[PDB]
């Protein structure tokens, strides 16, 4: 549907719209990779990211 590679690690990104505000996981392989997508994937869709929190927790 747009970006989102894999879910080896769960990254959290809370996004805010004109009124609505929600949280959505980011799916990528690398940290920076997800960091890119969290902003770069959501911002062209009119969604403005508010804050993120990567949840790696070594397996």
């Amino acid at each position: 549907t747009g970006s989102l590679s894999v879910d080896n690690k769960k990254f959290w990104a809370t996004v805010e719209s004109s009124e609505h505000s929600f949280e959505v996981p980011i799916y990528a392989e690398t940290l920076d990779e997800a960091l890119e997508l969290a902003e770069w994937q959501y911002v062209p869709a009119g969604f403005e990211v508010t804050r993120v929190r990567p949840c790696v927790a070594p397996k």
């Binding site: 990104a13 690398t30 940290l31 920076d32 997800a34 960091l35 969290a38 902003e39 770069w40 911002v43 403005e48 990211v49 508010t50 804050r51 993120v52 929190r53 990567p54 790696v56």
Partner: protein
């Protein structure tokens, strides 16, 4: 984490679409990449290109 670097190394900043801050830390403690998007309103660990240690910077959590 709180107001710290999850890994020791050189923490640097990158593009921010609006009022954010790209947190890209360059680990010296090991080959363990750690990057996130911390907003600019957040009291950051330190400035970009700065050397810090895992957890030890401003506030541990």
């Amino acid at each position: 984490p709180a107001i710290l670097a999850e890994i020791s190394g050189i923490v640097s900043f990158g593009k921010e679409t609006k009022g954010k801050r790209r947190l890209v830390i360059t680990p010296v403690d090991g080959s363990d990449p750690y990057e996130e998007m911390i907003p600019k309103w957040r009291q950051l660990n330190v400035f970009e290109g700065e050397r810090v240690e895992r957890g030890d910077v401003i506030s541990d959590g």
